[PDB]
Ligand binder design. Structure first.
Ligand SMILES: [Mg+2]
Length: 163
């Protein structure tokens, strides 16, 4: 197989700056504390780029999930009464994401939303709400920007297609 560029690095960058202005507008006037929560390992790169574009004061935290959805590593921060934005790299089935959303919901955050870089709507098995989407894509075999295919390509600066 081989990997071709699907969404170039510069397009991801321009799109993230828009998501950032958009998230900033949506939360700018809340005043409450804000927390961006990534799901490891996939979201680390998107989180790094996204949080630098969110001009609202906030903390960044991570959690690891994965039959029942279990927490392999919980949040270090408390979110009760805070605005929380879950940061995903890609959503397809939406199963894990919906369970994570429920788990976090029990902590009574002021608000809870999801921002994913890539969305694959045609694969949704459960229907979870998603407030911000970077790119909506067909059901393509994608890698890069945090997404791996058998432990590699995770470090590519662009989203590529495995051929
Ligand atoms: Mg993920």
């Amino acid at each position: 197989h081989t990997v071709e560029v699907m969404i170039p690095e510069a397009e991801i960058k321009a799109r993230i700056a828009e998501l950032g202005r958009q998230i900033t507008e949506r939360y700018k006037d809340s005043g409450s504390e804000m927390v961006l929560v990534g799901l490891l390992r996939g979201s680390f790169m998107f989180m790094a780029d996204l949080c630098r574009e969110v001009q609202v004061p906030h903390e960044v935290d991570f959690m690891t999930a994965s039959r029942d959805v279990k927490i392999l590593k919980d949040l270090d921060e408390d979110i009760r009464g805070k605005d929380v934005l879950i940061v995903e790299d890609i959503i397809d089935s939406g199963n894990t994401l919906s369970k994570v959303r429920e788990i976090l919901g029990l902590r009574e955050p002021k608000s809870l939303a999801i921002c994913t870089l890539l969305d694959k709507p045609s694969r949704r098995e459960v229907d979870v709400p998603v407030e911000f989407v970077g790119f909506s894509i067909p059901d393509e075999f994608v890698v890069g920007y945090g997404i791996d295919y058998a432990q590699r390509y995770r470090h590519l600066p662009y989203v590529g297609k495995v051929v």
